Amino acid sequence: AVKYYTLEEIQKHNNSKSTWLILHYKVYDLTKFLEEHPGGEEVLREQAGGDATENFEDHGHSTDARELSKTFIIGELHPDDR
């Protein structure tokens, strides 16, 4: 089964309590990863609540980084918002 979230729901997760973002139509909860992120937390907080695909790809992440990201996926962007 797959859980779908709308852009409306996602934008609400951009506070000290929760940090969600979208990458290639998948929704990632990075709340607990902010402080472990090699690239820093500021770069992640600035994209919170929205689609950060271009920025993610812009910094060209390694295979290990991409494999690790999967553990934070909690769902996908609703087809109607794509």
Ligand code: HEM
């Ligand atoms: C949720 C997925 C993410 C994971 C697991 C992750 C993981 C990592 C890891 C492991 C590195 C070290 C280098 C590498 O392996 O590529 C890295 C570096 C970096 N990440 Fe992420 N990252 C994530 C999302 C993002 C996003 C959303 C942005 C920006 C919008 C970002 C910006 C950067 C930057 C600036 C660096 C340093 C690049 C450099 O120094 O040249 N990351 N990330």
